[model samples]
Target: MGPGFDFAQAIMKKNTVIARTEKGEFTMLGVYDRVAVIPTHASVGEIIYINDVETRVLDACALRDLTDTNLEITIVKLDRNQKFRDIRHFLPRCEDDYNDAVLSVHTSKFPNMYIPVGQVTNYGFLNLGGTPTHRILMYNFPTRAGQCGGVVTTTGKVIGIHVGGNGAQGFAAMLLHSYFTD
Candidate 1:
């Protein structure tokens, strides 16, 4: 019922990455809603604090109470280019569902899936509202019913940000140029 990949094991590990607050004590963050029937996190969902090596809060919205406090599609300067140069060796990847896929690390470096943007699944997720094209397996990664803004990537290249959905759907941020460039 989780990500087709081992997202939890990697993501749930203590202190890999966290949404820092108050500055003194680093909390591991809201984890279990155990049942799909369970409620939620801090009543608000979680946000991966895009911060400095020691939590400088690069994105200011992360400093506000707005992220998961009843907003739809939380946006963090989608226009500004982002790249995490400091923590780059923590993540671990793929649509294949191997245990410990999505990492809860300080850095975000995962094994990339070369799945074409034109690819689709028998039952898939897409935010652009385009009629899905091909059939493949998908994931329900990094979301709380419908939360996004995770970086989705491919081999040795940058892909778009994941516009999270209840499913592993691709939103406008997911550029297909990686699929077309080759």
Candidate 2:
């Protein structure tokens, strides 16, 4: 039996903040996934885009237990526009070069969490040298310029966020919960 709750109504809504040198704003909607009995939190995520720009992570918090199965989040936009500027400037590089660089940086920061693949595929399978190899599914979604860093979900559970992808592909993203969070 499932929780007798309304998934649509329980969805969370966030404002898309388009920060300028001085000020900026926008808005979007997201659905929260309940923490399952598997002893880990659901992968609730977001994708944010700003004119080929990258914004700073001003603030992030997960408000849990809202309406029994939803997590409310409030993100504050920073005033500094340098982050977005760097991302905008780096957009012209080829996919291989660009992604390789990003993976390197993320690896240094996350340390064994981020992995890069040779080709873009709908799903991925890897052998982690464990009792049972892990299988991962990488799904691509279309997002606008202002929607990067925004969240993507499947079955109301956040799987990934809109990062950057190849030219032909709409956009590629990193899995926040599944990758970073244990």
Candidate 3:
């Protein structure tokens, strides 16, 4: 791959939004029509920002049981006035083979924006309870703060959602595949 517009075209720039909360900023992705997915841990804010413009969240979900899976996420409905491109087809499906090379874009206040790309190193389950398990994907990228809600994409399609991670490895959960909400 050469350094040109070809590689950049695969990025879902229109499907990503920067969410501002009392805690900090998080990257959210547009999945269903007007629904954007974000990590439950970062949905503490009262307002949202797109292109630095103030917006509102029409509805959101209360946190789910964490023990169920590390993939726990909160889906927010954006007002009609706010526009977000839906990427439901971008999600990984049985027809689509597994992707090893993927990228995640993180949003921040300033000087912290990142579009880290790497290969998925591992895939397994984290048993949290009796018959309770978490589907996790380990990537060879550094999981920094405020990246919880970012969407993991490959070939311009969403592969997973960044949940959390240790300093060395980044952890992600299958969004819409293992977990999804109406």
Candidate 4:
């Protein structure tokens, strides 16, 4: 409803990767250089295999709860040989509601799937996290097990990362441009 499948294909083929740990496998987004963002569920010091290549978690922010405004992301250093074809991101303006967006979920079973956005709800109340605010993007469509770290895009622009969902509502963390900057 927002951007066509062309955008989805571009993200899947370029910037997405399957991150596997000893406990589970999740999707991750390549931001820039060797730095990528992964879900916080990954244990610290755990070995992360990106697309079958070995890596490790560089850093991670604490996830107090669902309402935690701080981004639930783990910073990882990808292999020097690994390179994302493109890295584009979009930061929401003020209290923007992502009404119609596309979430690219990477499922090892197949390659990936682009799901439509149903609604967006603001979840953060206090300034307790990295980003100024946090949001949960809902989707009526069903999702797979390893889709926790999917990419949420609007008009072909990266806006957030899909955290997790309860079959009805999926949680997402809004991306901040400062994250990729020194």
Candidate 2 local lDDT, 1-182, one digit each (tens): 11111211222112122222221222222212211111012122232334335544343444323233322223333333332111111112221211111111111112112123223333332221131112232333322333333333322333333333333333333233322222
What digit string (tens of lDDT, one per residue) describes model 4 on residues 39-111?
7665535456877877755554444335545456666765457666546355454445666678787757646
Name the top TM-score candidate: 4
Q: Report the C-alpha displacement of residue 157, candidate 3, in angstroms.
A: 2.7
Cα lDDT for residue 156, model 4? 52
What TM-score does prediction 2 earn? 0.28
List TM-scores for all candidates, in order: 0.26, 0.28, 0.72, 0.76
Please estimate how well model 2 matches the true structure, expressed as its whole-model Cα lDDT: 0.26
Q: What local lDDT does model 4 show for residue 119? A: 59
Number of backbone collisions per candidate: 9, 14, 0, 1
Relative to the true structure, how large is the alpha-carbon lDDT of every model?
A: 0.26, 0.26, 0.60, 0.65
lDDT of 2 at 115: 24
Error of 1 at 77 (Å): 11
Cα RMSD (Å) between model 2 and the true structure? Answer: 17.3
Which tens-of-lDDT digit does each residue in 1-182 have in candidate 1? 24422433433332122233232212122211110000112122232232333322222121112232311122222111332232122222222222222312222322222223333222323323233322122343433322233333333322233332434443323222211211
**Ten-residue region with minimum lDDT total, candidate 2:** 99-108
For candidate 1, what's the RMSD? 13.5
Give me the displacement of residue 18 in model 1, in angstroms: 3.7
Quote model 4's TM-score: 0.76
lDDT of 2 at 117: 27
Name the 10 consecutive residues with the lowest summed lDDT in model 3.
Answer: 2-11
